[PDB]
C-alpha cells in the first residue's frame, strides 16, 4: 500500500523524530525536506542524549547515512 | 567489465585456495566456482575460527565483500592474463 516515499511525502510538515544509528542521539523537530537519497532537512530540532534533551538546535540537516529511522509523533 | 584480478579469480577454478574473511577466519579448500562479484563457493573447506580452533565444512559459500584477500596457487604467477602485449585475433563481427 504505502512505500517509504509516500510515507515520507506525507511526513512533511510534522514534528518528526529521528533515531540516528548510534542511540546516543535523536532529533525531534519539524521535517522540512527530503530527497530521493532520503537526506533529511528539519527545523527547530531537539537533541536527546540517550533520551534527555541537551538543547534545541534550530534548522538542521542530517545525512541519510547516520539515521537509523524516522518516526511520526 | 571485470578487470584483471577477478578474471584471475575466474581462472583459478577447482584449485586449492585460501581465503581470509574480515572476521579473521581463513577458509581453505577447492574453489568450486567464483563469480564476478567475488562471491566464492568452496569445497572440502577447512576453517580457522578467530578463537584458534579448526573445523571442517564440506561445502561453503562465502560472500565477496567479507573476503579479506584470497590466495590462489603459485603457478598462476605465469598466466596469460598478465601478458601485456598478446594481440587480439580479429574480434567478432
Amino acid at each position: 500500500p504505502v512505500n517509504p516515499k509516500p510515507f515520507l511525502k506525507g511526513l512533511v510538515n510534522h514534528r518528526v523524530g529521528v533515531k540516528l544509528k548510534f542511540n546516543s542521539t535523536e532529533y525531534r523537530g519539524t521535517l522540512v525536506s527530503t530527497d530521493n537519497y532520503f537526506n533529511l532537512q528539519l527545523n527547530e530540532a531537539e537533541e536527546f542524549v540517550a533520551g534527555v534533551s541537551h538543547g534545541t538546535l534550530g534548522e538542521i540537516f542530517i545525512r541519510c547515512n547516520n539515521v537509523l529511522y524516522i518516526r511520526e509523533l | 567489465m571485470n578487470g584483471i584480478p577477478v578474471k584471475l579469480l575466474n581462472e583459478a577454478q577447482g584449485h586449492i585456495v585460501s581465503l581470509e574473511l574480515t572476521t579473521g577466519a581463513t577458509y581453505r579448500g577447492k574453489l568450486v566456482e567464483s563469480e564476478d562479484s567475488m562471491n566464492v563457493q568452496l569445497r572440502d573447506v577447512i576453517a580457522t575460527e578467530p578463537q584458534g580452533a579448526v573445523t571442517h565444512m564440506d561445502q561453503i559459500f562465502v560472500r565477496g565483500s567479507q573476503i579479506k584477500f584470497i590466495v590462489v596457487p603459485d603457478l598462476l604467477k605465469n598466466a596469460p592474463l598478465f601478458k601485456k602485449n598478446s594481440s587480439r585475433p580479429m574480434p567478432p563481427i
Binding site: - | 578487470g3 584483471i4 584480478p5 577477478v6 584471475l8 579469480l9 585460501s18 574480515t22 567475488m38 565483500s65 573476503i67 579479506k68 584477500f69 584470497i70 590466495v71 590462489v72 596457487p73 603459485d74 598462476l76 604467477k77 592474463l81 598478465f82 601478458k83 601485456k84 602485449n85 598478446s86 594481440s87 585475433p89
Partner: protein
C-alpha cells in the same frame, strides 16, 4: 630505504615493483604488484603478510619489533580492506631491460598474429 621512487608515477607505472601495501587491520602485505583494477583489487606475487602482535604493540608505543610474518605467496588482495600502499623494492630488471623485453614481447605478438593469418589462409 633510499629507494627514490618515481616522483611522477602512479599505479600503472608502478608495475612489477615490490610494494608494501597496508590495510585497515594494520596488516602489511609485501610483494610484487602484477596487476590492479578500478577498485584497487591488487594481485601480489610472493606476498608475505606481517602483523605486529598485541604484545609487541606495547613496545611499539613511544627498538626491535617482532613482526609476525606468514607467507601468502601469490595472493590477490581487495580494494575494500586496504588503507594505503607504498613502494619497498625496485624491480629486478632495469628500464632498458624492461624496455627491450617489451620490444621482444611486441615482436613475438605481431609474429603470432602473422601465424594466425597464415593458419587462416
Amino acid at each position: 630505504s633510499k629507494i627514490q621512487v618515481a616522483h611522477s608515477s602512479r599505479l600503472a607505472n608502478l608495475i612489477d615493483y615490490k610494494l608494501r601495501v597496508l590495510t585497515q587491520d594494520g596488516r602489511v602485505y609485501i610483494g610484487q604488484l602484477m596487476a590492479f583494477d578500478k577498485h584497487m583489487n591488487l594481485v601480489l606475487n610472493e606476498c608475505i603478510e606481517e602483523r605486529v602482535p598485541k604484545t609487541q604493540l606495547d613496545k611499539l608505543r613511544p627498538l626491535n619489533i617482532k613482526v609476525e610474518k606468514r607467507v601468502l605467496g601469490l595472493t590477490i588482495l581487495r580494494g575494500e580492506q586496504i588503507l594505503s600502499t607504498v613502494v619497498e623494492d625496485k624491480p629486478l630488471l632495469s628500464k632498458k631491460e624492461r624496455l627491450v623485453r617489451d620490444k621482444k614481447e611486441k615482436k613475438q605478438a605481431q609474429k603470432q598474429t602473422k601465424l594466425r593469418k597464415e593458419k587462416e589462409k
